[PDB]
Design an enzyme around this catalytic site. Structure first.
Site, PDB file in Angstrom:
ATOM      1  N   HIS A   1      -0.222   1.201  -3.576  1.00  0.00           N
ATOM      2  CA  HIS A   1      -1.640   1.888  -3.689  1.00  0.00           C
ATOM      3  C   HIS A   1      -1.574   2.776  -4.645  1.00  0.00           C
ATOM      4  O   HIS A   1      -0.810   3.609  -4.772  1.00  0.00           O
ATOM      5  CB  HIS A   1      -2.142   2.548  -2.432  1.00  0.00           C
ATOM      6  CG  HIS A   1      -3.453   2.876  -2.363  1.00  0.00           C
ATOM      7  ND1 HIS A   1      -4.084   3.828  -2.881  1.00  0.00           N
ATOM      8  CD2 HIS A   1      -4.554   1.921  -1.676  1.00  0.00           C
ATOM      9  CE1 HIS A   1      -5.282   3.600  -2.700  1.00  0.00           C
ATOM     10  NE2 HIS A   1      -5.481   2.761  -2.187  1.00  0.00           N
TER      11      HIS A   1
ATOM     12  N   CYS B   1       0.927  -1.213  -0.210  1.00  0.00           N
ATOM     13  CA  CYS B   1       0.065   0.062  -0.069  1.00  0.00           C
ATOM     14  C   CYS B   1       1.020   1.208   0.250  1.00  0.00           C
ATOM     15  O   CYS B   1       1.577   1.560  -0.841  1.00  0.00           O
ATOM     16  CB  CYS B   1      -1.044  -0.038   1.056  1.00  0.00           C
ATOM     17  SG  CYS B   1      -2.373   1.264   1.309  1.00  0.00           S
TER      18      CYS B   1
END
Lengths: 187, 187
Positions: free
Chosen positions: B125, B105
């Site tokens: 992400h 992420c």
């Protein structure tokens, strides 16, 4: 105003099935209380993650009622939920007031223990089916998330996002669920 | 003997991206240490779940080295990892010894901060892409899990099971990963 969720956290709970719903519901603007069955003390989950609850169950109940009561799975966590008189009362009260109850994996076997929602279609983890089905009080489903009115159930760690988003949709509607879902990078 | 994982847990970490890898790796028989960046004290995660670490990072380092170092995401958790001299040293040492580093992420932006793995293909992400790509030191991927040798990256809460199973396969092989996967009820 905002909807409110009670997540009941007992020793041996499946930590993914606790954290995924709490986090997703908070992303949805739900006010979530993580309540320790045994008190305010930290809770040792099934795979040894230790979570500090927001409140004891005793205190959380005083701050109710809640738009949803959530029961994580993990066999030993579910057994502790099943054996608790306090959980019995909370679930009876929630059923009596026509409020949503959501349970995942072995969690739904606490509904059986407390005689909640008989006559509903339910799912569980595959390995918890026989326990749940003892007496034929529910009708079984293999859907990844099952919702029969105010009884919402699901199957395992790998269905926890679907379970949490189904809770969000029930409380806050489809558009909020879709908005919360996109930033998660689900398939 | 068993493989060993270090999961570095900082304030503001994404709790799903912490718990899913810890739990799945323990299901795989990996010995996991959840190490608090700031000490032994409980850690307040991004969506307010509070996790008690197994050890301080200082002590965990003394018990190394590890077969994998894992960096959860959450922007503020990743920033705290990025600002830590202790994390710098652990990641440099792991890179120097040719050990796996796994980040999800916003987590991979700590690799940028500490100048780890330049010249690798990485994912993050979507909202962390521009930060990760500042200077062009990595090549970007939109795969849900990316592995370029000893740098393993992934995208978000919804890719955390895939990320964790990729770690399991790298350490314990495909058969163990498949055995761990089935009881999770993934799609």
């Amino acid at each position: 105003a905002s909807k409110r969720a009670l997540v009941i956290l007992a020793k041996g709970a499946e930590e993914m099935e606790t954290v995924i719903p709490v986090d997703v519901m908070r992303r949805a603007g739900i006010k979530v209380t993580v309540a320790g069955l045994a008190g305010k003390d930290p809770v040792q989950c099934s795979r040894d993650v230790v979570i500090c609850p927001d409140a004891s169950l005793e205190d959380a109940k005083k701050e109710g009622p809640y738009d949803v009561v959530v029961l994580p799975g993990g066999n030993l966590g579910a057994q502790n939920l099943s054996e608790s008189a306090a959980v019995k009362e909370i679930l009876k009260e929630q059923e009596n007031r026509k409020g949503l109850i959501a349970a995942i994996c072995a969690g739904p076997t606490a509904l059986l223990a407390h005689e909640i929602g008989f006559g509903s279609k339910v799912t569980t983890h595959p390995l918890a089916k026989d326990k749940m089905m003892n007496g034929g009080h529910y009708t079984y489903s293999e859907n990844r998330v099952e919702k029969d009115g105010l009884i919402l159930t699901s199957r395992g760690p790998g269905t926890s996002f679907e379970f949490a988003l189904a809770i969000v949709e029930a409380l806050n509607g489809k558009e909020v669920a879709a908005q919360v879902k996109a930033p998660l990078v689900l398939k």
